[PDB]
Design a protein around this nucleic acid. Structure first.
Ligand SMILES: [Mg+2]
Ligand SMILES: [Zn+2]
Lengths: 139, 417, 515
RNA sequence: GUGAGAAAGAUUUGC
RNA sequence: AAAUUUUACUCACA
């Protein structure tokens, strides 16, 4: 007998949300029993070996940040930066190129990030994560 | 089939053509577009795809054949359906929000509301409490902290030696001597030997707390990082002596003795006895083949050991030292001593904070932050926040609390605010 | 060392307390405190303030978000073996699935609509009635909340029934909406520092600031107060049902059920209690059991105390205090002008959990500290270097690694000690991208996530349905054949593309690499 | 070491 | 034996 008729006994159709939630393996929890888990069965060693030979030679090279401006210490404020999500056509193309659908769907949604910042520039521009003190600007 | 969706279907398809001129979707609520002489399996029919489409709300399925295409009108200004075209066409077409009667609302009153309200009425209700009396006074002074410290000292006293804190100082033994001493101490205590590892067997428990006192502070704790790393490693893998550059410890699983079928391998809930070596000169001395060392034991549950071993001593010390005031010298009992005191004992205190899994020092630190930021506090109540003895239990937590209070006293004495 | 800091410091550099103690004692103590408050001899649980100010939301459509209804966190599922109640500890996803199976409903929204539209409590909804659902939803299980800084004795948290969660989701969503409407400080997209800055802006007029915390907050928020607030905001029968379930709740301690008619069991309805306070006045800025108010004269202080008493927010005489040049809210301390108070503050250390997770979390913490001005950049650079050295000392051994590539970190057998500034600017080997706080997940994180997915409570034999088309809604109903077709088509496309598994997608890297 | 069953097994422990 | 109701379960298979 199939697992569908046992996990969802009495129902012939379920929402994709429930089915996906029943098989979730991408949530990380920082816990005390981390070093023991990593040591067990040399799982981390095997994963590092696999990454160094199969996954590492696929990440594109990201250009480093260049632009920066003079900054001075100021009163604490909240920097709001709006990172927009992927467009429908962009998501369709990325899916067709073999990118993981879950990550593309997650990036589909527009989001806003609020961070406390204590440095300001002359032109009142935003700064990158952790580089406000040095003046690197989002541009 | 229902008459409440007549308007919904009408606006769904206004001028949508499928081949060249003919409307793709025909509303079943209008006789002009409805197909005569055929059964109606839905509120719309798609000639291009040759299938029926039925509109329903969130959680209100209708009685239609499974073959019919179902479109869900979600309450959050979005729509869901099987075919991509229908989902997209519905989204653009229904951009105007029109209310369809028959949608349950949060304030909906069920037919059992009166019965449930009556049942709640017949159930017990609370009584108004007394109005508290609050008097605002100045925060406690140095005298109150000294009184608390003296109360702890009188109640519990001090041990003759720093049992496991002494393990933070290198003993005068080499790797081979340390291993031999630890193995012979395990043998002397009658620990079972199995699969090359040591196991401590227990049968009966006294079921009373172990004696609690205050550990005197060793001179320094140079081997703090090594001790924490070794604790982590040993509690991850136990039974055999584990070595560091300058020290070694033995983690012994503690198991029940049940005869022949007794437990053989530790599980995730098995406690450990951590045995460490320190300089001789206490009641815990042990000698073998001319090698002398003080052997000290700490009984930790797996969570306690994981918490202790994962702390970062060096990073914590540096972060504290970023914006710290001058640390005064202190004596073995934590009292200010500018003559024979040592400033390295503070490191020992930090090590104690790492060895205490109850982390009462954090509670003391939070209350001290409140003390420093406060102008006026409640009378005879803010002081009680410094009395955390009833909250904790054990030698290490008690010593950590005592030395946190001593640190507060020293701060108030040397750098008054 | 925390005592000799020039600025403010909460002593958060170490991890919180932990132990393997059973939760019996804490749960029993909480229940006893709730009963004592119920007798009206210790604190006040009777609400007296007027909540007519709160707007009514009874005409809003009943909306449920399935995202929070399905989760890997624990929950209590009640079954009747022969004639007795058995409480099983499962995951919230499994509990919701079992509830929908017994009730025979496709989605939780259908279940709530069916429950709200039955003729009688005895009417059947699948294999169960509303009466049975209400009877089962009042059972709770107890557990210990460890790693809570400043609480050597761990508190007791409670796992609830799936039906209780289903109703609480709607109630709390609407309460949060009403709170956002009440004041601009309760906006959904607002950080703790933003809330503290707004608080500072709100209490600048007066002289004295009362930083207060509530004692026995969960044990003093009766079901009557919750029902009062829910009726004020117009929750209809959902609020009545939730109040009835809360009033008759039973907690399973060890192997015995204990009745706890008082309290609300450890923060199930934080927003509702915040509303219970905020609807009676506008002089407070409260977040559950923590608040700040301001005053000029002792008469205003007496009025504040009376308002707190009327709203069942019992002042904590042990922790609440008064300041003139400080402002503590949400654990964040600010000066009266709104600027961050100098010192470490709430900076928390990063424990050793994984060679790369530790580095990533340290980078995140140092970025947060440097941006806020807690420490200068060079101090963060030195701390990052020291943390890299410590990780190398702890993890550079055959157990965790067997490589010697130069670009690798010194803790993985390499010889690279990346500079903090170099890492933050993406000026490094791609292998270090995972260490960036905004970069991909690390190897340890993926390994631990998979191992967790393999745990007893979460293990399943269902054919995984991952890597879906973005255009497919997650509310679409699917069957076994449908999921089989989707997986077959996706696997065929992937094999045509020559990829055995999908390629990880990172938003930051993709956006940067674009022209 | 894997599976199942005990109010239950290590992502344990909730809002 | 100790930081003392905790350091404990059963079955099938390999
Ligand atoms: Mg507060
Ligand atoms: Zn000794």
């Amino acid at each position: 007998m199939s697992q569908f008729g046992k996990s969802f006994k009495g129902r012939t159709e379920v929402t994709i949300t429930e089915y996906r939630s029943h098989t979730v393996k991408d949530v990380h929890r920082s816990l005390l029993t981390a070093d023991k888990s990593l040591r067990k069965s040399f799982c981390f060693r095997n994963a590092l070996n696999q990454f160094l030979d199969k996954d590492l030679p696929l990440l594109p090279i990201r250009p480093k940040l260049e632009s920066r401006v003079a900054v001075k210490k100021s009163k604490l404020r909240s920097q709001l930066s709006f990172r927009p999500g992927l467009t429908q056509e962009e998501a369709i193309d990325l899916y067709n190129k073999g990118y993981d659908g879950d990550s593309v769907s997650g990036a589909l949604q527009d989001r806003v990030v609020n961070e406390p910042v204590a440095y300001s520039s002359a032109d009142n521009d935003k700064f990158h994560r952790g580089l406000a003190a040095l003046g690197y600007t989002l541009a | 089939m229902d008459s409440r969706f007549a308007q919904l279907t009408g606006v769904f398809c206004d001028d949508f053509t499928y081949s060249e001129g003919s409307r793709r979707f025909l509303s079943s609520y209008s006789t002009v577009e409805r197909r005569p002489g055929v059964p109606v399996e839905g509120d719309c029919y798609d000639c291009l795809k040759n299938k029926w489409i039925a509109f329903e709300l969130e959680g209100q399925p209708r009685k239609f054949p499974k073959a019919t295409v179902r479109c869900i009108l979600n309450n959050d200004a979005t729509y869901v359906c099987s075919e991509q075209e229908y989902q997209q066409i519905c989204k653009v077409q229904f951009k105007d929000y029109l209310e369809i009667d028959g949608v349950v609302k949060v304030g909906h009153k069920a037919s059992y509301d009166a019965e449930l309200r009556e049942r709640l009425l017949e159930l017990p209700h609370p009584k108004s409490g007394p109005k508290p009396r609050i008097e605002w006074v100045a925060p406690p002074r140095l005298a109150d902290i000294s009184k608390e410290t003296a109360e702890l000292k009188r109640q519990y006293g001090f041990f003759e030696c720093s049992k496991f804190l002494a393990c933070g100082e290198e003993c005068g033994l080499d790797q081979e001597a340390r291993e031999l001493i630890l193995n012979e101490y395990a043998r002397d205590r009658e620990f079972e030997f199995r699969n090359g590892g040591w196991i401590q067997r227990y049968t009966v428990a006294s079921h009373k707390p172990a004696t609690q006192k205050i550990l005197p502070l060793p001179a320094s704790a140079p081997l703090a990082r090594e001790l924490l790393m070794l604790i982590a490693r040993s509690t991850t893998q136990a039974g055999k002596v584990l070595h560091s550059d300058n020290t070694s410890i033995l983690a012994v699983p503690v198991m029940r003795d049940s005869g022949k079928h007794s437990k053989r391998r530790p599980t995730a809930s098995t406690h450990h006895l951590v045995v460490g070596l320190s300089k001789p000169g206490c009641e815990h001395d042990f000698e073998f083949d001319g090698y002398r060392a003080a052997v000290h034991v700490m009984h930790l549950d797996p969570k306690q050991s994981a918490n202790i071993g994962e702390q970062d001593f060096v990073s914590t010390r540096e972060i504290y030292k970023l914006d710290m005031l001058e640390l005064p010298p202190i004596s073995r009992k934590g009292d200010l001593d500018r003559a024979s005191g040592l400033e390295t004992r503070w490191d020992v205190i930090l090590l104690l904070e790492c060895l205490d899994s109850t982390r009462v020092s954090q509670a003391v630190a939070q209350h001290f932050n409140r003390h420093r930021l406060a102008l006026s506090v409640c009378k005879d109540e803010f002081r009680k926040g410094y009395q955390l003895a009833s909250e904790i239990r054990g030698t290490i937590p008690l010593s950590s609390l005592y030395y946190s209070l001593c640190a507060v006293r020293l701060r108030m004495t040397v750098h008054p605010f | 060392m925390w005592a000799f800091q020039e600025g403010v410091c909460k002593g958060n550099l170490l991890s919180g307390p932990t132990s393997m103690k059973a939760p019996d004692s804490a749960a029993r103590e909480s229940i006893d405190r709730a009963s004592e408050i119920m007798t009206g001899k210790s604190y006040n649980a009777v609400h007296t303030g007027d909540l007519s100010k709160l707007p009514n939301q009874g005409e809003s459509p009943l909306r449920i978000v399935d995202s929070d209804l399905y989760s890997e966190r624990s929950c209590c599922w009640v079954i009747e073996k022969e004639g007795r109640v058995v409480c099983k500890s499962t995951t919230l996803t499994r509990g919701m699935t079992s509830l929908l199976n017994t009730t025979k409903c496709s989605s939780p929204s259908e279940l709530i609509c069916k429950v709200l539209t039955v003729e009688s409590l005895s009417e059947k909804i699948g294999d169960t009635s509303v009466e049975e659902l209400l009877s089962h939803g009042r059972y709770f299980k107890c557990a210990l909340r460890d790693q809570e800084r400043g609480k050597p004795k761990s508190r007791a948290i409670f796992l609830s029934h799936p039906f209780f969660r289903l109703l609480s989701s709607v109630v709390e969503t609407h309460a949060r909406s009403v709170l956002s409407k009440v004041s601009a400080v309760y906006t959904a997209t607002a950080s703790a520092e933003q809330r503290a800055m707004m608080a500072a802006q709100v209490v600048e007029s007066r002289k004295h600031v009362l930083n207060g915390d509530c004692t026995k907050y969960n044990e003093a928020i009766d079901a009557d107060t919750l029902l009062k607030v829910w009726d004020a905001i117009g929750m209809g029968s959902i609020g009545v049902m939730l109040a009835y379930m809360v009033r008759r709740k039973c907690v399973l301690i060890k192997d015995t059920l204990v009745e706890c008619p008082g309290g609300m069991l450890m923060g199930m309805f934080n927003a509702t209690a915040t509303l219970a306070l905020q609807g009676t006045t506008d002089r407070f800025l409260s977040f559950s059991d923590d608040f700040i108010t301001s005053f000029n004269s002792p008469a205003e202080l007496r009025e504040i105390e009376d308002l707190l008493f009327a709203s069942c927010h019992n002042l904590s005489l042990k922790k609440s205090y008064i300041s003139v040049a400080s402002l503590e809210i949400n654990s964040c301390t600010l000066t009266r002008d709104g600027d961050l108070a100098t010192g470490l503050g709430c900076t928390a250390g990063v424990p050793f959990r994984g060679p790369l997770v530790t580095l990533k979390q340290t980078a995140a913490m140092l970025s947060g500290a440097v941006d806020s001005g807690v420490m200068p950049f060079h101090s963060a650079e030195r701390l990052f270097q020291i943390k890299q050295q410590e990780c190398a000392y702890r993890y550079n051994n055959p157990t965790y690694t067997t490589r010697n590539e130069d670009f690798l970190p010194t803790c993985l057998g390499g010889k690279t000690v990346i500079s903090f500034q170099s890492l933050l600017t993406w000026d490094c080997h791609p292998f270090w991208y995972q260490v960036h706080p905004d970069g991909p997940d690390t190897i340890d994180q993926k390994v631990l996530s998979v191992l967790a997915s393999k745990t007893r409570r979460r293990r399943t034999r269902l054919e995984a349905l991952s890597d879906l088309d973005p255009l497919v809604p997650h509310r679409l109903l699917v069957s076994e054949s449908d999921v089989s077709k989707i997986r077959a088509a996706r696997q065929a496309h992937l094999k045509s593309l020559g990829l055995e598994q999908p390629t990880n997608f990172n938003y930051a890297i993709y956006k940067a690499v674009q022209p």
